[PDB]
Amino acid sequence: GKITFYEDRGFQGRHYECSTDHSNLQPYFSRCNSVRVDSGCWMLYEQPNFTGCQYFLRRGDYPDYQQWMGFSDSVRSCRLIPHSSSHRIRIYEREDYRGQMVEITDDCPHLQDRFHFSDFHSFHVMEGYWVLYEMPNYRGRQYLLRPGEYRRYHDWGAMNARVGSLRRIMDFY
């Protein structure tokens, strides 16, 4: 993976070339107003130690933070998402894997209109890496879901339970 951060929009000003996870990007730049993703899928985080708002980026040019649905120009830590050869998640109606459940291996641009239930409060990621989104069609607040268990929204770093869509992370081309 290779990603480059730029302090000013349109790929200007101080920049930093990165090919690894970083828990603290503050030594290399103080703001991030544009990004070039040479390769790989990335989760960027507004605050150090993979905290605060999260944003999914993949190969391509992002001349403004709005292009990664940024809340601001803050980017202070990052993860390079490893490859997933398959994706499998269980979606549950209530917290702690209770209520109705559905298991999917594809993307879901609208949770509400698609299943036999209309409420979504816990997830079990069996395979692969996903991005959970606040709103349908992959908009709003973004949350990385890694292989593992998410009993309630606190587990995926949300301030509340609002969810709308689910996308597998895979490299473009």
Side-chain angles (χ1 to χ4, degrees):
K2 177 182 276 154
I3 187 168
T4 302
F5 307 98
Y6 302 82
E7 281 197 341
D8 297 325
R9 74 162 306 275
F11 317 109
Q12 315 287 320
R14 188 176 182 205
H15 73 258
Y16 179 60
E17 191 177 275
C18 171
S19 64
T20 64
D21 299 349
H22 276 65
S23 59
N24 177 24
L25 288 158
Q26 293 162 111
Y28 314 101
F29 53 87
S30 59
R31 56 185 196 272
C32 185
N33 278 282
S34 50
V35 169
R36 283 181 201 302
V37 181
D38 214 322
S39 67
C41 295
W42 293 82
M43 215 73 187
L44 304 193
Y45 299 80
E46 168 216 356
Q47 297 173 226
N49 302 138
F50 318 107
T51 62
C53 301
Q54 313 175 36
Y55 313 110
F56 174 64
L57 284 68
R58 59 223 127 145
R59 196 200 122 227
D61 292 330
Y62 298 76
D64 287 283
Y65 68 76
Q66 283 86 355
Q67 279 267 44
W68 59 75
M69 303 196 301
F71 280 63
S72 73
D73 63 7
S74 291
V75 172
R76 294 182 184 102
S77 59
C78 56
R79 282 182 173 130
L80 173 60
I81 309 304
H83 162 86
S84 334
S85 260
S86 64
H87 297 75
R88 186 176 299 282
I89 186 170
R90 290 164 173 178
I91 302 158
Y92 292 87
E93 179 186 26
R94 309 178 178 289
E95 302 188 351
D96 303 323
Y97 327 108
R98 308 149 36 239
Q100 317 292 325
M101 183 268 339
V102 71
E103 183 180 319
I104 65 173
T105 52
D106 62 349
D107 309 321
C108 189
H110 207 292
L111 299 171
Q112 155 166 44
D113 299 320
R114 166 154 166 194
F115 299 128
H116 50 106
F117 52 101
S118 320
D119 311 288
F120 308 96
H121 285 76
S122 53
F123 298 87
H124 177 200
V125 179
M126 282 169 61
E127 307 162 30
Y129 291 75
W130 302 67
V131 178
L132 177 64
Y133 296 82
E134 171 188 31
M135 308 293 188
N137 298 290
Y138 320 123
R139 286 286 149 171
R141 300 189 181 283
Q142 307 172 63
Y143 314 99
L144 175 73
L145 299 187
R146 303 195 300 174
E149 263 198 322
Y150 297 90
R151 287 163 106 177
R152 89 187 10 100
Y153 63 83
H154 303 87
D155 296 355
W156 63 78
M159 295 279 315
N160 71 44
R162 175 160 205 137
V163 286
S165 45
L166 249 178
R167 189 216 282 276
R168 303 168 287 166
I169 292 168
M170 359 217 304
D171 69 359
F172 271 138
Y173 51 86

